[PDB]
Symmetry: D2
Subunit: 125 residues, 4 copies
């Protein structure tokens, strides 16, 4: 089993009020659903990702990332977000991320295809 | 089946000489392996991601993303990369991406945890 | 004079304890000094940048950016950071930024030349 | 005078057809004008930035960055772009950059305030 498998598995919330539901597998897999409180999104979207299942023991965080394509049974926003970050355990566990949101564009609009931002996830709120 | 399921599935190469082997599923899943020609990496790493399986028909690209955690049977670089981008079909098919590489760090080093860059993948080279 | 010339001019502090001293000119110029609490840096570095001197009046923030090259009389870290963001006035004024730190590299190391992060500046601390 | 003062000073063009006119000062300053071939922009905009005026001599590039606020006498797009990158001299001199474009937004739209991309500048085209 992964070092932080139990620490990562569960329900997380970011500063926007979005809900990140994830299961960390012993093999390094991340699976679950994402519900965004903002943007062209409603209800849950499939997510998949990976995490370091044997992290350093020097107090460093645990690197991880995941992807949502913004298509479900309700809506298709023709776009995908990837979150890249690290899990930090302890009393106030956190997943600190930066993200890249790419829209499908024509080639003439490709220069403005990608948004960047940062989300912090906690176990509360 | 996804609109670009056949277009995306296969072997891709980026400008560094890295090899991206991916299968696009009818459900929007991306699965496969990544081999980086640079950095603290050797041989293949598991990847997983998502793509828009019903993209726009106005000539826009197909949004997608995937994650590699840099742990395999040979090495563990305690880090993860996410690629966010779009697939562009046609004679010279391309996957144009930007990426975020996060290292697990102490909190004192978290400000410098994340590298950003851009990779273009083609079916040749 | 710029709409937020007086709001922006002054001393700001980010979450790392770095000090951003800036003067906003009527013409859209930003001038001043930056002192980083972290990294290969000591004492003050020259900065220059630009801001929107006639922002929207619909409650939107004021877009701005600036650059530091990490060379002064004490040290040269062969690198430059740019901050891109917006000023938000009011009781708890803030400058919310994302930044790109590029190191001079050989071409073989150029893929890992750039760090990305986010700093929030306030008038206190 | 800066090591690459003469190498950097002049007219540059990126892959979009935008024109970057810059003067590198002996003190590390960058001054000039930017004309974007795309987006909410017409004619020239003021730019200012900084570069490493005493770079490494091991073949590494020269770190630099600059800012444009997208306001001039013709238009105001209430936004600013910062380019962060490095100058690479030689027969085919290049300035390789990544950039952050921030729009002034309401707080409700701040999550989508920032675009990210990459521009390569050459002395031809
Ligand atoms: O809302 C969505 C899906 C929901 C996204 C929610 C985000 S994930 C990161 C963050 N954390 C979170 O919990 N929730 C948010 N997806 C399309 C987003 C529309 N774009 C316009 C289309 C377009 C056309 C042409 C060029 C570019 N886009 C947004 C505008 C924009 C700004 C900057 C860069 C790219 N796009
Ligand atoms: O090599 C690796 C794994 C291989 C990465 C290969 C990359 S994926 C994007 C690109 N496309 C590709 O095909 N191949 C490359 N992983 C650790 C990378 C070491 N870092 C030092 C550790 C550290 C300690 C403290 C703070 C930050 N890192 C790299 C240095 C760095 C620079 C900037 C930002 C973050 N880290
Ligand atoms: O410390 C510095 C100067 C001080 C930077 C302070 C930063 S500004 C953003 C932030 N807000 C703030 O208030 N303070 C910090 N400058 C070089 C930074 C060394 N790098 C290693 C050299 C190298 C060699 C080869 C490839 C890449 N770098 C850092 C490691 C790194 C990680 C990821 C991407 C790039 N570089
Ligand atoms: O065109 C401009 C000014 C010209 C920009 C030209 C760019 S510089 C980088 C690149 N290299 C170059 O040579 N030329 C381009 N400036 C506003 C740009 C409108 N935005 C909509 C407003 C808005 C409202 C709410 C939230 C976000 N924006 C663009 C859409 C967008 C997508 C993603 C992230 C942010 N904004
Ligand atoms: Cu949009
Ligand atoms: Cu280890
Ligand atoms: Cu978009
Ligand atoms: Cu490293
Ligand atoms: Cu559609
Ligand atoms: Cu690293
Ligand atoms: Cu370093
Ligand atoms: Cu206006
Ligand atoms: Cu560096
Ligand atoms: Cu726009
Ligand atoms: Cu030196
Ligand atoms: Cu915008």
């Amino acid at each position: 089993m992964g070092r932080d498998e139990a620490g990562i598995t569960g329900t997380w919330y970011n500063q926007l009020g979005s809900t990140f539901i994830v299961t960390a597998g012993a093999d390094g897999a991340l699976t679950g659903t994402y519900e965004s409180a903002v943007g062209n999104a409603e209800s849950r979207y499939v997510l998949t990702g990976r995490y370091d299942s044997a992290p350093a023991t020097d107090g460093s965080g645990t690197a991880l990332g995941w992807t949502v394509a913004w298509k479900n049974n309700y809506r298709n926003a023709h776009s995908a977000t990837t979150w890249s970050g690290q899990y930090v355990g302890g009393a106030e566990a956190r997943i600190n991320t930066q993200w890249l949101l790419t829209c499908g564009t024509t080639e003439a609009n490709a220069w403005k295809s990608t948004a960047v931002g940062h989300d912090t996830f906690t176990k509360v709120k």
